[PDB]
Design a protein around this motif. Sequence first.
Motif, PDB file in Angstrom:
ATOM      1  N   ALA E   6       0.801  -1.209   0.000  1.00 13.24           N
ATOM      2  CA  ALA E   6       0.000   0.000   0.000  1.00 13.24           C
ATOM      3  C   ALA E   6       0.839   1.266   0.000  1.00 13.24           C
ATOM      4  O   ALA E   6       0.276   2.361  -0.072  1.00 13.24           O
ATOM      5  CB  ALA E   6      -0.944   0.010   1.211  1.00 13.24           C
ATOM      6  N   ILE E   7       2.165   1.147   0.018  1.00  9.37           N
ATOM      7  CA  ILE E   7       3.061   2.293   0.141  1.00  9.37           C
ATOM      8  C   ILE E   7       3.815   2.469  -1.160  1.00  9.37           C
ATOM      9  O   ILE E   7       4.529   1.563  -1.606  1.00  9.37           O
ATOM     10  CB  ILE E   7       4.057   2.129   1.297  1.00  9.37           C
ATOM     11  CG1 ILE E   7       3.320   1.943   2.610  1.00  9.37           C
ATOM     12  CG2 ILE E   7       5.005   3.308   1.346  1.00  9.37           C
ATOM     13  CD1 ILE E   7       4.227   1.763   3.774  1.00  9.37           C
ATOM     14  N   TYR E   8       3.709   3.661  -1.725  1.00  8.87           N
ATOM     15  CA  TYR E   8       4.485   4.048  -2.882  1.00  8.87           C
ATOM     16  C   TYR E   8       5.421   5.160  -2.437  1.00  8.87           C
ATOM     17  O   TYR E   8       4.964   6.184  -1.909  1.00  8.87           O
ATOM     18  CB  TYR E   8       3.564   4.519  -4.020  1.00  8.87           C
ATOM     19  CG  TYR E   8       4.203   4.473  -5.390  1.00  8.87           C
ATOM     20  CD1 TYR E   8       4.935   5.532  -5.867  1.00  8.87           C
ATOM     21  CD2 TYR E   8       4.046   3.378  -6.217  1.00  8.87           C
ATOM     22  CE1 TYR E   8       5.530   5.490  -7.113  1.00  8.87           C
ATOM     23  CE2 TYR E   8       4.635   3.334  -7.472  1.00  8.87           C
ATOM     24  CZ  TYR E   8       5.378   4.392  -7.912  1.00  8.87           C
ATOM     25  OH  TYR E   8       5.966   4.365  -9.158  1.00  8.87           O
ATOM     26  N   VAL E   9       6.723   4.955  -2.656  1.00  6.05           N
ATOM     27  CA  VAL E   9       7.786   5.885  -2.263  1.00  6.05           C
ATOM     28  C   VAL E   9       8.644   6.162  -3.501  1.00  6.05           C
ATOM     29  O   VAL E   9       9.429   5.301  -3.922  1.00  6.05           O
ATOM     30  CB  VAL E   9       8.672   5.342  -1.118  1.00  6.05           C
ATOM     31  CG1 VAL E   9       9.753   6.348  -0.767  1.00  6.05           C
ATOM     32  CG2 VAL E   9       7.869   4.994   0.141  1.00  6.05           C
ATOM     33  N   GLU E  10       8.506   7.367  -4.074  1.00  7.26           N
ATOM     34  CA  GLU E  10       9.418   7.878  -5.102  1.00  7.26           C
ATOM     35  C   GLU E  10      10.462   8.754  -4.427  1.00  7.26           C
ATOM     36  O   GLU E  10      10.085   9.761  -3.802  1.00  7.26           O
ATOM     37  CB  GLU E  10       8.659   8.686  -6.164  1.00  7.26           C
ATOM     38  CG  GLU E  10       8.204   7.923  -7.441  1.00  7.26           C
ATOM     39  CD  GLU E  10       7.823   8.841  -8.615  1.00  7.26           C
ATOM     40  OE1 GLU E  10       8.357   9.961  -8.707  1.00  7.26           O
ATOM     41  OE2 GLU E  10       7.001   8.435  -9.467  1.00  7.26           O
ATOM     42  N   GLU E  31       2.941   8.019  -0.869  1.00  3.37           N
ATOM     43  CA  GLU E  31       1.511   7.750  -0.907  1.00  3.37           C
ATOM     44  C   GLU E  31       1.209   6.435  -0.213  1.00  3.37           C
ATOM     45  O   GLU E  31       1.971   5.474  -0.320  1.00  3.37           O
ATOM     46  CB  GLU E  31       0.956   7.672  -2.335  1.00  3.37           C
ATOM     47  CG  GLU E  31       0.476   8.985  -2.906  1.00  3.37           C
ATOM     48  CD  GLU E  31       1.052   9.282  -4.250  1.00  3.37           C
ATOM     49  OE1 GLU E  31       1.610   8.364  -4.865  1.00  3.37           O
ATOM     50  OE2 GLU E  31       0.935  10.429  -4.706  1.00  3.37           O
ATOM     51  N   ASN E  33      -2.254   3.901   0.266  1.00  2.00           N
ATOM     52  CA  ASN E  33      -3.659   3.649  -0.018  1.00  2.00           C
ATOM     53  C   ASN E  33      -4.295   3.111   1.249  1.00  2.00           C
ATOM     54  O   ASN E  33      -4.062   1.959   1.630  1.00  2.00           O
ATOM     55  CB  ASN E  33      -3.813   2.672  -1.178  1.00  2.00           C
ATOM     56  CG  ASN E  33      -5.251   2.477  -1.576  1.00  2.00           C
ATOM     57  OD1 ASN E  33      -5.933   1.599  -1.057  1.00  2.00           O
ATOM     58  ND2 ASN E  33      -5.745   3.337  -2.453  1.00  2.00           N
ATOM     59  N   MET E  34      -5.072   3.960   1.921  1.00  2.00           N
ATOM     60  CA  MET E  34      -5.702   3.549   3.163  1.00  2.00           C
ATOM     61  C   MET E  34      -6.686   2.424   2.940  1.00  2.00           C
ATOM     62  O   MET E  34      -6.955   1.652   3.867  1.00  2.00           O
ATOM     63  CB  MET E  34      -6.398   4.745   3.802  1.00  2.00           C
ATOM     64  CG  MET E  34      -5.418   5.852   4.134  1.00  2.00           C
ATOM     65  SD  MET E  34      -4.326   5.414   5.498  1.00  2.00           S
ATOM     66  CE  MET E  34      -2.878   6.414   5.164  1.00  2.00           C
ATOM     67  N   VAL E  69      -6.528   7.557  -0.848  1.00  3.32           N
ATOM     68  CA  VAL E  69      -5.097   7.346  -1.041  1.00  3.32           C
ATOM     69  C   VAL E  69      -4.407   8.597  -0.495  1.00  3.32           C
ATOM     70  O   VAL E  69      -4.309   9.631  -1.167  1.00  3.32           O
ATOM     71  CB  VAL E  69      -4.748   7.053  -2.507  1.00  3.32           C
ATOM     72  CG1 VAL E  69      -5.399   8.044  -3.454  1.00  3.32           C
ATOM     73  CG2 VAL E  69      -3.237   7.004  -2.712  1.00  3.32           C
ATOM     74  N   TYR E  70      -3.938   8.503   0.747  1.00  9.28           N
ATOM     75  CA  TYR E  70      -3.353   9.652   1.425  1.00  9.28           C
ATOM     76  C   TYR E  70      -1.956   9.945   0.898  1.00  9.28           C
ATOM     77  O   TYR E  70      -1.170   9.035   0.620  1.00  9.28           O
ATOM     78  CB  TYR E  70      -3.297   9.425   2.943  1.00  9.28           C
ATOM     79  CG  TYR E  70      -4.613   9.667   3.665  1.00  9.28           C
ATOM     80  CD1 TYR E  70      -5.809   9.223   3.142  1.00  9.28           C
ATOM     81  CD2 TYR E  70      -4.655  10.352   4.870  1.00  9.28           C
ATOM     82  CE1 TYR E  70      -7.014   9.452   3.793  1.00  9.28           C
ATOM     83  CE2 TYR E  70      -5.865  10.585   5.528  1.00  9.28           C
ATOM     84  CZ  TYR E  70      -7.037  10.129   4.985  1.00  9.28           C
ATOM     85  OH  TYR E  70      -8.233  10.356   5.630  1.00  9.28           O
ATOM     86  N   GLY E  71      -1.651  11.232   0.773  1.00  5.59           N
ATOM     87  CA  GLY E  71      -0.353  11.677   0.327  1.00  5.59           C
ATOM     88  C   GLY E  71       0.472  12.166   1.503  1.00  5.59           C
ATOM     89  O   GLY E  71       0.012  12.200   2.640  1.00  5.59           O
ATOM     90  N   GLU E  73       1.616  15.245   2.222  1.00  2.53           N
ATOM     91  CA  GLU E  73       1.117  16.493   2.790  1.00  2.53           C
ATOM     92  C   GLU E  73      -0.241  16.334   3.458  1.00  2.53           C
ATOM     93  O   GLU E  73      -0.806  17.332   3.924  1.00  2.53           O
ATOM     94  CB  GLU E  73       1.019  17.573   1.712  1.00  2.53           C
ATOM     95  CG  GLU E  73      -0.055  17.320   0.640  1.00  2.53           C
ATOM     96  CD  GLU E  73       0.249  16.155  -0.282  1.00  2.53           C
ATOM     97  OE1 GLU E  73       1.431  15.928  -0.592  1.00  2.53           O
ATOM     98  OE2 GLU E  73      -0.694  15.442  -0.672  1.00  2.53           O
ATOM     99  N   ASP E  74      -0.795  15.128   3.473  1.00 10.85           N
ATOM    100  CA  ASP E  74      -1.957  14.797   4.280  1.00 10.85           C
ATOM    101  C   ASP E  74      -1.589  14.089   5.571  1.00 10.85           C
ATOM    102  O   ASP E  74      -2.477  13.807   6.383  1.00 10.85           O
ATOM    103  CB  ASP E  74      -2.934  13.936   3.473  1.00 10.85           C
ATOM    104  CG  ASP E  74      -3.543  14.686   2.309  1.00 10.85           C
ATOM    105  OD1 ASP E  74      -4.090  15.778   2.546  1.00 10.85           O
ATOM    106  OD2 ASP E  74      -3.481  14.197   1.165  1.00 10.85           O
TER     107      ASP E  74
END
Lengths: 127, 166, 127, 756, 120, 196, 102
Positions: E6-10, E31, E33-34, E69-71, E73-74
Amino acid sequence: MVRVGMRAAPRVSLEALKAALGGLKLSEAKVYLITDWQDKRDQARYALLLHTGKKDLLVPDAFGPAFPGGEEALSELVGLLLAQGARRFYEAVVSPGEMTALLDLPPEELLKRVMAIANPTDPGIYL
Amino acid sequence: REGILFTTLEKLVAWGRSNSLWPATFGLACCAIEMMASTDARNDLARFGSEVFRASPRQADVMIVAGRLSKKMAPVMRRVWEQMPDPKWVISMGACASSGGMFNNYAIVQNVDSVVPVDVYVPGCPPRPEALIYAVMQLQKKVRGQAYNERGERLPPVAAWKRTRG
Amino acid sequence: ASSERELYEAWVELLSWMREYAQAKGVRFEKEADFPDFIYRMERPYDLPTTIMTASLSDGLGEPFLLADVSPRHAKLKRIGLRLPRAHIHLHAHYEPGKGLVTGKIPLTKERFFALADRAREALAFA
Amino acid sequence: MVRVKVNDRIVEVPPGTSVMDAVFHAGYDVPLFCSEKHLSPIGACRMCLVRIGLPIQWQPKLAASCVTAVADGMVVDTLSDVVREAQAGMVEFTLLNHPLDCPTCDKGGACELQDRTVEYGLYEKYPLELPVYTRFEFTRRHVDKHHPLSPFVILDRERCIHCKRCVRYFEEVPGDEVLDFIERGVHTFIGTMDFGLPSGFSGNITDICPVGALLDLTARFRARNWEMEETPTTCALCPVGCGITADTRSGELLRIRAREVPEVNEIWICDAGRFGHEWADQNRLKTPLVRKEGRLVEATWEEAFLALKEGLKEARGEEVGLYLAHDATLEEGLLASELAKALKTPHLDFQGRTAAPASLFPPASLEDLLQADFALVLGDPTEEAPILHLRLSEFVRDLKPPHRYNHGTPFADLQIKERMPRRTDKMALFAPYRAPLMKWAAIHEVHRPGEEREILLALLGDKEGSEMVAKAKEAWEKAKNPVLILGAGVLQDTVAAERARLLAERKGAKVLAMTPAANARGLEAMGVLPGAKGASWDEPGALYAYYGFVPPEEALKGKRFVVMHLSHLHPLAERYAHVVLPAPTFYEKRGHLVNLEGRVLPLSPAPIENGEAEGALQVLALLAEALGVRPPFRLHLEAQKALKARKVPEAMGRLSFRLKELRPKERKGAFYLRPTMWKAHQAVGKAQEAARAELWAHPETARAEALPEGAQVAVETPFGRVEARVVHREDVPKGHLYLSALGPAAGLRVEGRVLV
Amino acid sequence: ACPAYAIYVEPAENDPENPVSAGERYAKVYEINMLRCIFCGLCEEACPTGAIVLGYDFEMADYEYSDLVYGKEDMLVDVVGTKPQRREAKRTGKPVKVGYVVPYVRPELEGFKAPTEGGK
Amino acid sequence: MRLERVLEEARAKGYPIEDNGLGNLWVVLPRERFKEEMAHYKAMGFNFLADIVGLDYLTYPDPRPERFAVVYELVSLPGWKDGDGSRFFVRVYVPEEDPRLPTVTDLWGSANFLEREVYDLFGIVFEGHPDLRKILTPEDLEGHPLRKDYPLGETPTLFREGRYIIPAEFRAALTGKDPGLTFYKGGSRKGYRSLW
Amino acid sequence: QITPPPRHLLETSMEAVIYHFKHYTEGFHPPKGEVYVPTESARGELGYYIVSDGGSMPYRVKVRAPSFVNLQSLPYACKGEQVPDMVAIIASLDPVMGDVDR
Ligand code: SF4
Ligand code: SF4
Ligand code: SF4
Ligand code: SF4
Ligand code: SF4
Ligand code: FES
């Protein structure tokens, strides 16, 4: 397995499928709508795999609002499937990079993959 | 007549439905037990209007899908939903229901929105009972016409009002 | 003992001197590395005045002619080191109370460091 | 063979085997940092330590299995408590000064140091003892960090564990000592006084370095090793077709790495093929364009096919041109062949077609070249067929194909010693300029363009050549099993190619033909060449044409209908083309190629963002409808059926196909198009300056022509207008201007003029 | 470490002029995805720098899949509230009130402001 | 006490005895002797039939006799009439092209649902079963999931702007047949075991 | 090899960082072998039959489901019983379908 239509040609694919289906009874067939991006249907594209049980029919990713007239083409397509008595509609979620090669895999592999990944779906969401 | 065509009457009937929201649980997994906890004597969904709980589907407006929805259960839940009175809403409880969750495989539907028109999503594994109350107030104010998304759009009171059922 | 605090203070002082020489002579200065005990400290406290462990003076080509480093907060035998690459030249500065920063017994003055850096530039710098 | 026993198992093993390879051949394991495949093992990391008995007569001290030979009936112990304890200690010594960068290290999941650490380190000492990870509690080595050594390579001297891999390679395989240690003791660090990293094979040290010292600048900070999707495929930039691995994530191309296939490319890739990917995923065409109001407009595929039907309704089948790209797959070539068979047209061709077909010559295998006695070369291997430089570096040192173990290629080949001497008598080279490999070519002569044919006449013996040419003739005569290598100068001149054919037929000798086109020999084998009339890829003969590349402006000028199937958008199309269509790159294609050694190679599709692109297979299938003809190929499976019907062997199978027909064409010699490794469409991002055009001139003629040593001079060719930096070279013959041929148009002599 | 992926890290390279993280690397895109997130805490457990730490907000029920899908800055400590809570406080002008109280916040949450037991 | 007699009886007839130093015991009977041997086992007093577990060894790094292997678990309750407490496994290999095996449903009614499950997940057909009906997989599901030739069927995970994850290409962990991300895996990552 | 390094010295030791990184990405590799252990839960005998192939992910994990094996006795248990009691006899058997179906 037969492959009719061509990518990004909604009306050509729709008319080719209209001709090729004929009077085939779809009471026991399964209609797999292959698309990406589960949530956003407004820019979604669709391919179709029709698994009759005795033979399969492939249409590439040429449907959906992603293409001009592709939304109405998908609506007419699902409406015709329902009219012919199709009841089992499924939605398959593949990656954008997959969607192209997935239609170039051998029939048994492509069909086994689609049947594994397909989700039961309300055809109404395509009407 | 759907609660429409008069400025006062529609707000009044939406008020009524929003507070009279009748939950019908469709328990699938541990999300179902964490929803059963939303009724005990610490935090009860028995104040806003959800005291009564009629197992019949002919008698409830809110359908709460609580748990992982197996593909073998999809047509059953589909027909339980279709066999509901028409002013009806759908809540999707938990990760397994909202998305495929941690079970990303042939067995579980990867979005319940595939089979039923979902009104509210509530993440969590399990989602806390108070998160479920937040979701029902969310749906409350949604059918009140007080709900907006991140894009600025107001959301329709009833989803499954927008689908060509068949 | 408590020499550590003034050691890191003079370390910040030497970094200030390097920055000033860089700006004056129009030659590249670079912060090479930060403290792992500050990166990977998650909740753990950080009392050091700065988080920088390594710096360098590179010529126009980017190849350094002067390197300067400080020992981490948790290492034994704490020192500050200087090195001229390609020149097999290494210096070890400590801090003596009251006197100041000293290479062995010889006071390490800003003027001394400036002369060393100018010689290093003129000799080692390729461009 | 030699009899070995590894800890519980018995192994037959060839005599020249390394103890380490005997270990792994038995299926065991041992740390490995200093040694590398195809590189001279020298005990530096001291990681491969094992126990050896040769009687129970155990050796006193541990044997470095990487540099220890094997003896008949030898015992090797890798499981002893003392052996594993020493392995852990050496791992600790290696980890002594490492910078603590694993989470932020671009080396990520695949770090030999990480993996051998987690494999062999922290031996079980003898309870619930509280153990210590590190005993060393002093200051670690801190040196220069993240230093760009070149537009493609970054250097972290702290992560270097001072193995010998990169300098060893630089000395041995490419022969460019542009990297070495500077100081000694623990102050040792990698540096260079040759800063540009001149070698065209520098990027392999990035793959070799077991740590994150040497990393890829073009892919820095894009994704972690496990996160990337690996698409194994073949590179279609030149006809040697190395195996490559395309790393792709979230629809974009991140990084190219080598794919090992000892048959052709061992573990090596060229810098151009490896770093010249910036153009494929950056800016490309995604929608078909159609000309409506004297300009181009985005259109549906339906509308474009409507325009196609209309523009081809009034078209006769003998004026239609079918022109494919140099990387066109066997399927596409065969479909074009069959479609021009049905639709009778005399002119179909492909982008890099040579006046003399490469099918004229018998293909040679690279291991045949390793076993060959002599090599007669005309052309520049470095620029035309890059990895041929590396196979010739193996050849020149008398190296020969190793024995094949159970773990595959040997980890430590005792056949490869360090600082090996290179023979200057094993080959002869003839190039129009002083080529780099002339260092190892004792018999070598810098000639001028259009002189090859005369060198080959002299080698045949109908006339007498220079001292160098007579020496080459004599060495070729004495050669029992020589290999003849031919480039664009030979392959583009009918008479020179024919004399090569004669020479290599008279003496039983195979040929390596450097085509400017990647799939040239496979397209030939699929029958893709012009007929009697003969409008070729560069000839404006047809009236209607389909182009899979960018032709000379004179080919577009005049035609009634032109349909270009490109991947990027060219101005030459928005001024002369009526219908443009998106095409996928070879990175994202699927199909087959034929190596310049006759081997068929697979292209797997990479998940890069293609848009609505469609293969030339489907484009031609749709183009035949507008003409009435029904195409025989639509899909890859049917294409494979008809291929196998055409008797093209399985992948890695060598394809036998000869041809006897020549299409001669006059050559207007004023400007020369210098064959280059770097290709024009690669001048994007960090390859911008590396793929620049050059104009080389002899200082006298430059001075007479007013061409300064640094000038960006514009040049006009029938192939377009390009600016090029002016380089003065005293090895370039006077009266000539070598212009960088950054396409598959290399080796051509053209008119032109220097614009001011 | 994510079992639900669920975790995307660029990632990207820190800018010396205006740095973001402590090393040469920071989170360019983070990001989660909750709706995919199963709430292990394995992401924090693998966090070497203590950046990612599970919080206390639970009032994150929302209407749209794509809004959950929380970012980055959220999720920064500076933010007070969940996405619908903040959206309601903006379309309402009435400040955010969290529906929870705790005895104290964990040290790993340093900077995370919350109502604590009656300290306020 | 009954386990000692099982080991003695199996060793005399040439039945392999597999043992790990952790305390687990197997007795592998051939296909022929399977039915009658386990009937004799029930006769010996094995009250309880715990499990019927099917195994697909297709992707196993070391080879095995046949692709499929079925393992039964037999027990004798300690607190019943005369309870020793002896529990043990019986492994029986099954060819890929002969997914047959006699049921013990007639012996234990426990085997009923377990053998139906093994037939559902692997194509293993149990002879003499009262009802071999698909239990768990959907009525319309095609094939047998747990044999390795059957895909797991993952769906990509979704993010904001074209950013997605494919788990099968995102996984950093390795299987036994996975070479790893370096040139090879040795040591611990070819198998590790501590010495207690 | 089993337990991640203590999180406090992740800022000090290269071995700590390497082991943390490797453990949290790949994990660890148990020996090749099959194993099983029985336990008593509030629904009976429970156990895992684990086949490990020496990789970082298990080769196969089969679960003995007590709620699954207990369900074979339902037709017998409620045989001849009342219709209202068919619900009570199911509730009294303590089933969990997360365990049964699994
Ligand atoms: S989201 Fe978690 S709590 Fe809910 S059904 Fe799935 S596993 Fe159970
Ligand atoms: S080189 Fe290897 S051990 Fe060193 S920081 Fe990078 S991943 Fe870690
Ligand atoms: S830079 Fe890398 S390859 Fe070169 S010596 Fe150091 S560790 Fe070895
Ligand atoms: S350009 Fe030629 S030499 Fe370079 S990677 Fe491609 S096939 Fe290999
Ligand atoms: S808590 Fe962390 S590791 Fe677990 S599912 Fe959520 S993001 Fe993934
Ligand atoms: S010493 Fe480096 S592996 Fe032999």
